[PDB]
Amino acid sequence: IAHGDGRRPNKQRQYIVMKACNKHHIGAEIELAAADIELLFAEKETPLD
Amino acid sequence: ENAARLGRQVLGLLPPPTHRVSLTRGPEFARGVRDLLSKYAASTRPTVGSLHEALRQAPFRQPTYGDFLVYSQTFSPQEPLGTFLFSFKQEDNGSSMDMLLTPTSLFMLSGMEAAKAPQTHKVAGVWYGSGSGLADFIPNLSELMDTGEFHTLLTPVGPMVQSVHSTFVTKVTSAMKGVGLARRAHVGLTLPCDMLVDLDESCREPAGLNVTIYASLVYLRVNQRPSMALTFFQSGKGFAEVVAMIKDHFTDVIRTKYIQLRHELYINRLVFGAVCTLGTVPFDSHPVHQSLNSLPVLVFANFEAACGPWTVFL
Amino acid sequence: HPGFAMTVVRTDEVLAEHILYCSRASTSMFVGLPSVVRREVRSDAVTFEITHEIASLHTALGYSSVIAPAHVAAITTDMGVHCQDLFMIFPGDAYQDRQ
Amino acid sequence: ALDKSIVVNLTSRLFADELAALQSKIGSVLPLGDCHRLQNIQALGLGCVCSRETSPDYIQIMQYLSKCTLAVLEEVRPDSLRLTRMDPSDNLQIKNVYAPFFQWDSNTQLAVLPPLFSRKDSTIVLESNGFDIVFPMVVPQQLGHAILQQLLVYHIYSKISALDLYTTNVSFMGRTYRLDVDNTDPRTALRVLDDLSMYLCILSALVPRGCLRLLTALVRHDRHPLTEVFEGVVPDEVTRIDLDQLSVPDDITRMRVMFSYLQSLSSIFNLGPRLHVYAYSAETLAASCWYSPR
Amino acid sequence: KSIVVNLTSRLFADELAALQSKIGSVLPLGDCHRLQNIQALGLGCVCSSPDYIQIMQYLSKCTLAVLEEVRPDSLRLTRMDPSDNLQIKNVYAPFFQWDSNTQLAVLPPLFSRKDSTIVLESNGFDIVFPMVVPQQLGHAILQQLLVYHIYSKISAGAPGDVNMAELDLYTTNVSFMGRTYRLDVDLRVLDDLSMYLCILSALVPRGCLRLLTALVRHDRHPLTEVFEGVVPDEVTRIDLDQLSVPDDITRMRVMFSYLQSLSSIFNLGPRLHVYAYSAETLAASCWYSPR
After folding, report:
1. Which GO terms describe its cellular component (chain E) (predicted)?
2. Farthest CA pair distance, chain D
3. E74-76 and E288-290: which strand pairing?
4. CB under 8 Å to E224, separation ≥6 — which residues?
5. Which of E101, E229, E271 is nearest residue B87 as measured by Cβ atoms?
């Protein structure tokens, strides 16, 4: 608050605070059959049934 | 120009980068998953280029070499590469030295009989002209064999990798873990046929993944004096069988030992032997017989070294 | 009635549902590019492994969330009458008598 | 990554009855013969060493079991059995299946044992193929040693006699279980006992004199919780060694030499390999152990 | 391989330099993930009335770690893998002068607290360091302090049997690697081995005559003929008829159980193999092999 008329403040204070980031681990598992990966990627690029 | 040649060699031995598939954007997820599945399908086919890509994934652990420094009269210049190494550390020397005992040099300290060892007795005398230069550096070759404390002082180290021999100081490098690379070939551990006693020979046990090599150090008397005898064994039968199989090998020694202990009993005299665990040879890699100058020496392959504490047997 | 009175202390577990208030924009979140490591390569099928690893950061100077007790669920502890028998804890401290 | 899988080809399509008995045994550890990918069924189970026509030797089966490679069952088809195998240091998932149930937790040990409590419960037959798969059992070490305790008691006293509440029953905490030792070959179970007799008349030859006197100041004077096997009657042999005086430089050797023959008794009280469990889920009975042989 | 131990209150100036010394040290840790508190590291769950075997069996079931950096607001660790090369500083109290090419072991603490623990008052939980001694010394440091704990119980009831001038001459002086070490003794740690090695001390002479006379047959192992002539004459006069048969079973079901749980605590393997050491830098590279 501004000065004057019987009002005496604890004039403007400034922190400088250093805080830390907190890491987190998230796991997941995808299983895929080897048949569908191979038939969807073939060296002969003719179309499929 | 010559600095660009090294840029092609470092960037051809780098590990493969981990796939970074962004799970927050729409089309960037679709084009990152497609490069996982256009790349596993080209690592499965039996073509040569797919096998060319398959070996860069290298999960190799490494050997940890120990650099020793031995006097040149306790260690021959004529040592076969792949000899097993011990360390005798009885006291603190005034200088930073170390005593490394090969199994043909520990034959001269022991004084075990040449009827047991016909071929490594002629070899251990032609390299060591008197046997005194070894025995002068151990002042307790009778009080460490009486009480049964010599096996507490040896630590197993591993096969030998490099031997820079000089006049007074010999530099010896060992391989304490893993397969030792020479200093480039892979050095396999070399044992004489005189010391190695197989257990897997017989007249259908499982073909396990692994077979181990043990080291037995056995206390006994010859010429009514304390001595010992170090033998090597090789089996993969698990720890409960082999300790029961080593007691069958030393049946003739214990029965001729306690004829004298039936006379008098000291508590320093009861401890008999100790079994270590040296390392693991892979299964059915047969050792190749070699000769030195005619010394039958079994050299193994892919022998990675381990270290077991000396456990007593009797 | 022996002349001395005594007091009794009992414990009790309670399953309790809770209400968690959180304020607006209290924590900033971050996102790393998640990595796909492959493992357990079978001839039948492949397994993948995705790690999303993420750092969270707390912001301004006070606590920004307050938990509360709420509607109570079932009581786990019996609230019964049973006392801890000191014969069972400390057998070493015993009478000098035998019988 | 590296491959580890052992498919077992069934040479005949197994029945619908014995397919449900195998699928109940999913995630169960069973020891097989060789470390390669295509495997015969006659090298799958433990039935090569635990027969029906001959007397099963529970030492010799257990002696056989720390030789083998161990595998974990993952899928039972009517045409094939797929098994992952156990590398000597690899985090792998395992499931608690076995019928005498015992609770596991994290940071426990496990040990693979022969089918000691019930042979018929472990052996399921494949009469559509001619072989019987004999599963082992995995048991924590405080119980796993305790069966090898009670089995070595049995082969001593039943040789003395030739009664069924002390020599056979295994006392777990709050439970007693009967062992199946009715028709057994003891010829290797007496070989372990012939190896105890060497260590036991060595440990008796160097007993420290100070520890004999600490009994006689405690078996009749005060109360200790586990001395209650000894009553106020002291053994007659303790006082007949008490008659000489104490001496410290003759008991440091009688402790050091007694220290080394207690390290040697871990060659005579061995279990198989160990399964260092680091996680456990009781809603699924699905642990995740960490293998280490020897 | 990094584990961060958060501290919600900052450290004192006295407690900071107490851990600046112990900057490389092996510490047990009840779980192997990283987000753990000050109450997790050390033996504070079991040492802060300690008993021996509960701590020795805890170390094999544990995941050890190595300090690397001591900062004011927190601490930082390093998880120690099976067969992993490291660099450990000799900082342990009391000082034992490690040698290169040895086999270091990890023992529970059994000496005084000012060498064992560091008392923290910034958060109110005192951390406990283990005893990292070479293997041949750490088993000679305990086959005497278990002898000393026996005679401090004989001379407490019968004080005329034990000479204090000869008891504190041999039991508190250990000589290893040509160096004599005098150890500090005021023992409530070893009050269970003294009650296991003595409850096993009487059953062994009764047990070997019970087991030599049971294994008598044509198919006797030949070496046990020779190992019969070692047991003394008084043991060969024990009347086994003064007990009953259902009492004689419980002197084997208890007897062998003090030959397994007493044997499998000395063959425990939280050990590590130093392969390079310098006596003035006190640094040691090693590898850690569990069991």
Report:
1. viral capsid
2. 77
3. unpaired
4. D194, D197, D198, E212, E215
5. E101
